[PDB]
Paper text:
Fragaceatoxin C (FraC)11 is a potent haemolysin of the family of actinoporins, defined as a group of ~20 kDa protein toxins produced by sea anemones. The lytic activity of actinoporins on biological membranes is enhanced by the lipid sphingomyelin (SM) and by lipid-phase coexistence. Here we reveal structures of FraC corresponding to four different stages of its activation route, namely the water-soluble form, the lipid-bound form, an assembly intermediate and the transmembrane pore.
In the monomeric form of FraC, the side chain of Phe16 is inserted in a hydrophobic cavity of the β-core region.
Residue numbers in the entry: 3 to 179
The structure:
């Protein structure tokens, strides 16, 4: 139940994600991400792109059907008024790419949490262009303490939940449509 590990998919829940948050300690902005793979395919880590912030965790390399990966991120350490924003990319054994955006801002006077999930045709690494697509162009979900569902095409669908504060949990389930 640590970031960088995989757990049985059925075990994923907000308690495990709070555990992940608690392990990062006293930092101002941080995120715990759990993504439950119920897609019928194996996922292999590609990379994480950070627009800002960092993780000390390696993406779980192999995520079999029926497993959830756990991951985390935090703001850059130090007197920088910035949050943690980035895109995770996994390659799926059908030849496509699962991409996940998470965005936790510094200033909640003016900005809000967001996330997004998309499947890309072919093998595509996470990068600043992918961030811009996920954030500006592909209808991200607000981290509004609510669940959101969307078909992903490719026979899959996504259902996820993110809270609205600067200690963020993001729980996503990828299932057969
Ligand atoms: Cl915003
Ligand atoms: N601080």
């Amino acid at each position: 139940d640590v970031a960088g590990a995989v757990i049985d998919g059925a075990g994923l829940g907000f308690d495990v994600l709070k555990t992940v948050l608690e392990a990062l300690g006293n930092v101002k902005r941080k995120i715990a991400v759990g993504i439950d793979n119920e897609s019928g395919k194996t996922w292999t880590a590609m990379n994480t792109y950070f627009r800002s912030g960092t993780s000390d965790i390696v993406l779980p390399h192999k995520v079999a059907h029926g497993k959830a990966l756990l991951y985390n991120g935090q703001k850059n350490r130090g007197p920088v008024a910035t949050g943690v924003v980035g895109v995770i990319a996994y390659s799926m054994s059908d030849g496509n790419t699962l991409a996940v955006l998470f965005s936790v801002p510094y200033d909640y006077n003016w900005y809000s949490n967001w996330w997004n999930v998309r499947v890309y045709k072919g093998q595509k690494r996470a990068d600043q262009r992918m961030y811009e697509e996920l954030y500006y162009h592909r209808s991200p979900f607000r981290g509004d303490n609510g669940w959101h569902s969307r078909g992903l095409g490719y026979g899959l669908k996504s259902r996820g939940f993110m809270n609205s504060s600067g200690h963020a949990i993001l729980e996503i389930h990828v299932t057969k449509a």
